[PDB]
């Protein structure tokens, strides 16, 4: 199993790593570029619809017809079942997650209806609204414990918890007389280029979020900016600290594959696909 699987024994992880990075990352560049093409013959009929063109942050991250998520149809619409979203596999369900775009202000209510329809009882913000002066993703959210609608659902902040790279937001969701609580997990501490760096911040991000959510049996809402890139890092990493408990392999690479069938771009970049790896070599060595 050599195609879309490369596992490796977590027992000899180490010395991969060392074998993997060596000569300036040439066999983790050539990995990677292994994954280009994977899940790109497939369509993306609808989020090219005029009518949802509108709906997308970026002309070139759309998501695929077989796995986009669907909203409710509204009577009078068209493509008023469209969001930029995609179920995605995790540890646990193959459609664990629910990934989409930071939601443009057009399309908040939309983002919110999503978590309602989809039954999420948490959300996976991995951006900050603005970086490096560009607006990278409208705040869907209240600032305060002042109740905001958005479309049919009430949005209002129980409590936030402050931490140095994280802030959790407890909202309680009401759809008419219907009523539940959602938690918001929000990594506020992605550098403006690159990684992060150390990497362990995020693995005690990935650490807190497990550890808070349990087993989740209800999609999990995971977005950045085009969700893609940092979104495909955190699921990836999510997914190994998982594997790792009941395991004697990690298969980074297959878990990538698999993503990538599944929405554009899942692990973006070489970079954050070395990340994965390098957060990973920092557990099996205590940190």
Not at 218 to 229: D, E, F, N
Request: charged share 25%; aromatic share 12%; glycine share 4%.
């Amino acid at each position: 199993s050599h195609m879309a699987s490369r596992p490796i024994l977590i027992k000899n992880f180490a010395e991969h790593y060392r074998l993997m990075s060596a000569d300036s990352d040439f066999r983790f560049s050539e990995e990677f570029e292994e994954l280009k093409h994977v899940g790109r013959d497939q369509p993306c009929t609808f989020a090219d619809l005029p009518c949802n063109r509108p709906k997308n942050r970026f002309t070139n991250i759309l998501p695929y017809d077989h796995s986009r998520f669907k909203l409710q149809p509204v009577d009078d619409d068209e493509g008023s079942d469209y969001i930029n979203a995609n179920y995605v596999p995790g540890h646990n369900s193959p459609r664990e997650f629910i990934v989409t775009q930071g939601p443009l202000h057009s399309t908040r209510d939309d983002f919110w209806r999503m978590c309602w329809e989809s039954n999420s009882r948490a959300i996976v913000m991995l951006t900050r609204c603005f970086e490096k002066g560009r607006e990278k993703c409208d705040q869907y959210w209240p600032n305060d414990t002042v109740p905001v609608f958005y479309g049919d659902i009430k949005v209002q902040i129980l409590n936030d918890s402050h931490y140095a790279d994280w802030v959790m937001t407890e909202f309680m969701l009401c759809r008419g007389s219907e009523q539940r609580i959602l938690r918001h997990f929000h990594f506020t501490t992605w550098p403006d280029f690159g990684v992060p760096n150390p990497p362990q911040t995020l693995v005690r991000f990935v650490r807190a979020f497990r550890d808070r959510i349990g087993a989740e049996q209800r999609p999990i809402v995971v977005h950045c900016s085009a969700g893609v890139g940092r979104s495909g890092t955190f699921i990836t990493l999510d997914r190994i600290l998982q594997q790792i408990n009941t395991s004697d392999y990690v298969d980074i690479f297959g878990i990538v594959y698999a993503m990538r069938k599944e929405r554009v771009w899942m692990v973006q970049t070489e970079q954050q696909y070395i990340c994965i790896h390098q957060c990973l070599l920092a557990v099996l060595e205590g940190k």
